[PDB]
Subunit: 331 residues, 4 copies
């Protein structure tokens, strides 16, 4: 393949480090070696995270087309919109964000702390849909005399939204060369799908596509699974994967998404605590805590072969913790 | 000097990056070149920050001393205690934190979001109110406590971390092929600027370290920086005395109190966040940011200067001031 | 029957007023006349409400026994525990409250606003979680004598008396008014409110005109408690009938989705009532009974010309714990 | 004096009760007898309070003029706007509330609990401007009034706290009236009255009311504005205008207006440590709550006045509880442990 064909706008510090989770690994029995690749520490732009890696391949186009405003969308505590806001400010672009009530949660400061607080501080025009906003948002930009660059949910369903994480696999191989071994599995939280899609494509290149273990956080597996597949095939062709993405190449575990998107279950909370207390690494109740829950449970259930080396991709999301303060009042 | 005689326990990803603040620089006239060294992005341990760089020289001693519990203290939205909680969990140690009511601020979730929320998730014993009664607590419980003062500052090793910072900067200026004429840094408990004063004294730039007070008690802070600088310069073999001239502390941006932002703080936070995508907080960094911007604006920095802003972290505290930024 | 037998400690301003809800009545078709009896405005003690009327019959005993501490229990936003805290302060007694999380809710200020905030200001020892037995024992082991007050004062011998009087009161008022109400709508969760009413209205044969509207979301259990308490009560005041299960009417249609959580209908009802009458209701209790009364009138479940008396039991302070839901009204 | 000349629209349950504060009295020395008239329990419309008494005399006019919208204004936790919202809904009128943060305070749920929360549920159009807006500067008040017109309605203007309005002092003239009657049952006259003052027509009505029987200077106003001179002058002026309005056969002397300044700090909307001890002491002895903004400050006043012996031994003091309790929700951090 050839990802280098597409320009990359630097928004990150550089390759993201991989760190062993030896304490958590031991705590779990020492049979499986757990690691984490820190995407959540990839940037100086309002904490960055996985979406910022994706944005690197979209920005060149936005600039090429002469756009002056980045428009995007997501829930109240969306990480995507905050990163779009930081990237826009950094680039000297305006930013319009459509924030919808994507979650059945009604915390007193849900819309005033965490991610959305930063978006407003970063100067984005943050629009709360009542209670098409998207098209109104795009048009309002034109009417203003601007030129909007449309960034869909999570940057996923976009021609360029999968390039980012092909590069991720590209990084992992380079790091595997220094480590002298290959990771047996990758655990990643999936919702809008282009993170896992990029990974699927990137690891298909060396036959590990089916080793990318996605953990659904959407609580709507079928739609998510379908979107990962579609985006992966599309990206595969965009980069030249000398192989095809089969349906069996997309692995999406649906056991840890409950009860709904944006709501943690008790295992989510346990995992967040276990991981935080054994490694000093925080995860959130919406996304990462669920993929962490999955990984630990998998290890716990012996689903990972003794001796395996599992690479947990930490995608970011921690600032959303602020919207669930009551759950963690006593820790 | 020889900082190497002191062991450093890795808690960071490595040297922190230096970024150009081209947009902000251009916004302010283009006569002064602003940069930022991201101490706020130095670790995977709950966001890290300046305190984490300090703890790298304290941890070896706690370990040497066979301690099993880290003990520290700070205000409710303290960044110090959150970093101790993370470093501890990472190291497999217990953690007791004394969170005092250090700010005359009244907010509904002040003790449930941001820094303190993380410390609890991280497993720390968070006690709201002192220092002694706590340490003794661990002893009485049968554990060996490692006492860590506010900001890791007033401690024999509290100044080493930032002596290393000046060292790092020297290597980066070498790679860059140019030198920074000044550094702007926020000062409250002191060892951050003190380590800096010692490290830059080494190459005659101690007076180029422009501290910005955020304590609102500039005299004590100034005296504490100086004291710690003197002790640290002795620790590392600095071949010279630290004079009053080497300790520069601006007092103009601390208002109105510690933990409380003024309107200049707020404007600085917004300007910096909207020109660079880089966030700062109402307690500490927003004030040093305010200070730096004002300085450039007043023309206090010779035209052509390259100023290195040290971003110490502190962003999570933003959550405790939600009402103020409700509309931006 | 003979309620007068039992001593009532004054904690209220006196009988509660009954107001017409002309606007709400006209709005829903004018076919049914709605009124409200304001138990929510019955006392100067931290807003009071139905529980305070119940407490008038319990306090004499606590005093007779020489108890020095009132101990009680409820969820984080319990109205009962706040009224107990207020009565205590007033009486010069200590107060220990067992606050449990009875609701699958997690709002950021849930445990710092409304009812629980008032109990802490009123001087109560608010304990956030054998929970209850431990509290009672702790008071003893502290050298004090605790007077036990079960959830909502309901499962207590004297807990059903307060509302037998409610029925006494309504009769006196219907006299002054020169007419009688065909129904009473009341929210029911722990039970002694409707039980007291059932007993009191059986006295003149209207027990089954008391339409209880469940807010527990466990109607079988609540229905049984109202039954059980009304029986222990109709017997204590010497009613000349045994309370029949058919005397206990309890609609289960409006308690959804869980106790402590409103459904879309609850919200609409709170807004309609508030916007036509200027009378507020909460999402835990009264909003649900209000939702029921409105739905009943809208479905024609009340025969034309009927005069319905809605008993407003209090609970408004709890609104503060559901701030996100009402951010725009 | 002839208050009966002006119509009054019932918005309250009837005369408000007077309760003895025996435990608090005993606790302070027993040397002074404190009582309290519950204006705070005066209505079924969203907890009512002193402003609702004032409103009974304004509504007839609004109705006589055929207005269909009530327009008012106040800070975020204003008790005034919440009562206007409840009265409007109760009458079948629309309501526009112009609001802005009038306090140097910024609690996380300040604009979403307590008073303002109720106004929104009550169906009022709550126009809350962002910081820096300055409604007083732009004159948002007037724009709100025109917007109603331009919209096809007829607004009835209700100034901050109902105070600086031709009928705003009437309500509390009636209060002195009520007090006389009730004193006629007690068989004794209260030697003093303690009342919290900010926009002034509460105390103003009382001054006019008690002037009629020579006790104007017995109305001990306690400033909650932290801007005593302006408040004092507003009371005096409103009193004189109201006296003339109701036929008082007297000239209100500067000496008839008493406004203590010692308990208003540090600013309007912020409690001092004294305010807090006062709220807690009164709550823990009587089960009667008061707030960090208004009532808690006058309660702190009465208590301090008694403790200091500024009240002659044997004196009977009538504390007027104006309401405001819902505002406590906006100060949860301060009361997190009580
Ligand atoms: C967006 C996001 C995800 C899921 O990534 P997708 O590409 O949408 O599948 C997981 N974790 C975090 C923290 C995110 O922000
Ligand atoms: C602790 C801290 C400071 C001040 O550092 P000192 O060494 O105590 O002077 C500045 N900024 C942030 C974000 C901090 O956490
Ligand atoms: C307790 C309560 C109820 C239900 O009364 P029960 O006697 O427990 O059935 C209804 N409304 C409010 C406001 C309450 O506090
Ligand atoms: C408005 C108000 C006051 C002060 O009354 P003014 O007539 O404006 O002087 C005092 N207490 C409460 C609770 C209020 O709402």
């Amino acid at each position: 393949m050839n990802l280098q064909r597409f320009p990359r706008y630097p928004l990150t510090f550089g390759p993201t480090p991989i760190q062993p989770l030896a304490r958590l690994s031991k705590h779990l029995g020492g049979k499986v070696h757990l690691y984490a690749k820190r995407e959540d520490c990839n940037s100086g732009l309002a904490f960055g995270g996985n979406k910022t890696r994706k944005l690197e391949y979209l920005i060149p186009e936005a600039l090429a087309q002469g756009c002056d405003t980045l428009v995007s969308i997501g829930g109240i505590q969306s990480n995507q919109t905050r990163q779009v806001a930081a990237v826009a400010a950094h680039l000297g672009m305006k930013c319009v964000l459509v924030q919808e009530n994507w979650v059945n949660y009604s915390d007193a400061v849900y819309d005033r702390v965490g991610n959305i607080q930063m978006s407003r501080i970063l100067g984005a025009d943050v629009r709360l849909v009542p209670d098409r906003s998207w098209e109104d948002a795009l048009e309002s930009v034109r009417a203003a005399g601007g030129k909007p660059y449309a960034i869909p949910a999570g940057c996923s369903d976009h021609p360029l939204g999968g390039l980012g994480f092909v590069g991720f696999a590209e990084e992992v191989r380079a790091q595997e060369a220094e480590l002298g071994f290959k990771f047996d599995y990758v655990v990643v939280c999936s919702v809008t799908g282009s993170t896992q899609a990029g990974m699927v494509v990137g690891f298909a290149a060396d036959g590990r596509a089916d080793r990318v273990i996605g953990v659904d956080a959407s609580a709507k597996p079928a739609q998510t699974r379908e979107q990962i597949t579609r985006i992966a095939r599309q990206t595969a062709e965009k980069v030249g994967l000398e192989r095809d993405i089969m349906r069996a190449d997309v692995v999406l575990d649906e056991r840890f998404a409950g009860p709904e998107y944006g709501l943690p279950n008790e295992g989510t909370l346990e995992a967040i605590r276990l991981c935080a207390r054994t490694e000093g690494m925080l995860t959130d109740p919406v996304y990462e805590g669920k993929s962490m829950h999955g990984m630990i449970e998998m290890v716990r259930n012996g689903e990972f072969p003794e001796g395996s080396r599992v690479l947990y991709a930490h995608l970011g999301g921690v600032p959303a913790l602020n919207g669930y303060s009551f759950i963690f009042r006593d820790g």
